[PDB]
Amino acid sequence: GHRLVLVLGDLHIPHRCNSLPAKFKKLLVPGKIQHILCTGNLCTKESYDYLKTLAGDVHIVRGDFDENLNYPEQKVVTVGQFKIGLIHGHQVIPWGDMASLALLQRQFDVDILISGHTHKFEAFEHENKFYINPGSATGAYNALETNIIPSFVLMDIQASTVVTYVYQLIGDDVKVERIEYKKP
Template sequence: MSWLPSAMAGEHREVRMTYTICIWPYGLWDVVSVLVDYEGYCFQDPLRPLRESVEVGTMVLVLAIGDLHIPHRAPDLPAKFKSMLVPGKIQHIICTGNLCIKEVHDYLKSLCPSLHITRGEYDEDSRYPETKTITIGQFKLGLCHGHQVVPWGDLDSLAMLQRQLDVDILVTGHTHQFKAYKHEAGVVINPGSATGAYSSITYDVNPSFVLMDIDGLRVVVYVYELIDGEVKVDKIDFKKTSTATI
């Protein structure tokens, strides 16, 4: 099974947010200063949700989030992120861990009942598994916090974990730095730290999370990053090239 990235990470598309925060695709919120085109659709009306007239079909939205470290390294999620993340808009949440307290678990559960969490080294709840696999549509996803992977964030070590879990997409954390890339036979995604908490690697961390749009053999990865008080959005598009059994 192989993958083809149809948009490389360097081809950034940016939305600078004003007034009300917009979380896209599909216009979960609807007021922005600039709307970019998406699959050939370009909307100039800032009050019109993205792709509001397009049939959603089998699309599934998956929030990937982690390394919040509340309250030890951050008091809460950024207010702009909290205003974007509302109940009823997301079908699944996958969390890499380090929530670190029950209140954060309950908050994520209030956004979406389908919540999947792996244990970070600072999580109070020892019941979280070290790794977890779930199937969403045509994709098998693997989840692991990442502190178990040595060296931390190493491409070859993560590829080995991906093979062990036998997954198409590996979601991992611990480095507090967003990454999304094709490697060997699959895709690796690190949503970063949703609160911008410092890590043992760096103190310079921008808050970020990832929204995955899974539709058929395609997954579109949107990274939301808070930089200098503004939410910036980048898009990376990956496709499977076969329908082999997962």
């Protein structure tokens, strides 16, 4: 049994980017995605409607610039055997700190923590817990980085194994990487 989750965030349409990269839209076809977890900063209803055309279950958290202030600050969604924590990450002091995120993984009692304010992609296992920072799909700028690479994560969950396919657009080519995670 395969469950597909699209980990996305920091689109910043149209505050910092007009749209997603050209190739990503071609790759993201409707029907192949079951859940969509967004770290936030879509900033418009248009990106939310675009996500609604890609899957049925669409969980979005509040960014630091999202227009809809009713999106939850943090969320816990159970897909397969895995509980996943979703938060934008700008609450975290400092941004992207390991301990400051382990605190959230303790609070939520959660298996995967997704947080993406720092637009650089990351994926690390700390204290037998999985942390994914999917980066910015549109490559939106931040003061923290010089060369932002558009990226998004796609988790295939089956029983206890999550295979994470990470899509990054370098130059004009979409590289994909495989990350293996197994819950003890």
